Amino acid sequence: NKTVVVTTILESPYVMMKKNHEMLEGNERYEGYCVDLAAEIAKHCGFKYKLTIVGDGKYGARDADTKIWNGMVGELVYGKADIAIAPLTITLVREEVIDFSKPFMSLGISIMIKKGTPIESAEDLSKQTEIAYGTLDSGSTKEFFRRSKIAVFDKMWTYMRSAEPSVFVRTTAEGVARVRKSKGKYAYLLESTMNEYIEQRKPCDTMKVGGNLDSKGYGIATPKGSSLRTPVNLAVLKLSEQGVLDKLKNKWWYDKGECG
């Protein structure tokens, strides 16, 4: 039986480098929610696997010109990986080229501010120009704003797409740093999951504000026609019903809380 190649992404607390990683080899180098999730899926489906960090560090989007897929989605599409186990958002354009399991975690787009920033909603952001705001590149949040027909979000997109200097970031960490070092002059649009995690990390200077802008989920992805599709889906449902997914959420978000 062949070793399953898992594509994932370095995104805290989903996949993180272990303290002693320089001593370690293979899967032992990593820890986090998706590392634990990969182990559980593999156990239930009965396969051996190798965790591999996506080469370009991206989630996945299709270039409007070339129509080529990048990120983890690209790795599945082009045969470079057998499965993605990551905070990968279930979307229509992605479901057209890969398969997703039932969602293992719920999330919505949300707003991160530096504490004390005079903003409490997306409407607030759209009605002013003093505080800049942006999203991650090559992900579902950027596509959300690009495609939205809702007035407030369309207004936000029109601003973001032409903002100078660029309001878009290559990694979540870059977005977080920009909030922290901009004296309240930058707000970051990101998924509630990542937002809530950062909010509980030192130096405890960020805050989630307003309601989630949408309601969606992360799913485990496989290339079309994969023999792993059905087993993985059943595994996710079993893990959900056994309470394992809730246990892993508490382990990596709330048991780790640093902000009291």
Ligand X SMILES: CC(C)S(=O)(=O)N[C@H]1Cc2ccc(-c3ccc(F)nc3)cc2C1
Tokens coding 195: 């937002």
Number of residues forming the site for ligand X (CB under 6 A): 13
Give the distance, in angstroms, between the CA of residue 22 and the centroid of all CA atoms in the same chain.
26
* Other C-beta atoms lying within 10 Å of the C-beta of residue 212: 16
Q: In whole angstroms, how close is the CB of 192 to a second copy at the nearest point? A: 13
Query: What does 88 bind: a second copy, ligand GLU, ligand X, none (CB cut-off 5 to 8 Å by kind)?
Result: ligand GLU
Q: Please tell me whether residue 233 binds a second copy under the rule CB under 8 A.
A: yes
Stretch that binds ligand X, among 5-13, 66-74, 99-107, 183-191 (CB under 6 A): 99-107
Q: Is 216 in the site for a second copy (CB under 8 A)?
A: yes
166 belongs to the binding site for a second copy (CB under 8 A): no
13: contact with ligand GLU by CB under 6 A: no
Please report, as residue ranges, which positions from 201 to 240 form the binding site for ligand X (by CB under 6 A).
215-217, 236-237, 240
Is residue 191 close enough to count as binding ligand GLU by CB under 6 A?
yes
Query: For residues 175 and 188, is the Cβ–Cβ distance under 8 A?
Result: yes
Helix axes 151-162, 140-147, angle to 10 degrees: 110
Pick 89 or 117: Cβ nearer ligand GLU: 89
28-67 positions binding a second copy, by CB under 8 A: none
In the chain, beta strands by DSSP E: 4-8, 16-17, 30-31, 49-53, 83-84, 98-100, 105-107, 109-114, 132-134, 186-191, 206-209, 216-218, 221-223
Three-state DSSP class for residue 32 = coil
Which parts of 127-252 fold into alpha helices (H)? 140-147, 151-162, 172-181, 192-199, 229-241, 244-249
Q: Does 127 bind a second copy (CB under 8 A)?
A: no
Binding interface with ligand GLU (CB under 6 A)? 59, 87-89, 136, 139-141, 190-191
Give the interface with a second copy as residue ranges (CB under 8 A). 90-92, 95-96, 100, 102-103, 106, 144, 147-150, 214-217, 219, 233-234, 237-238, 240-243, 245-246
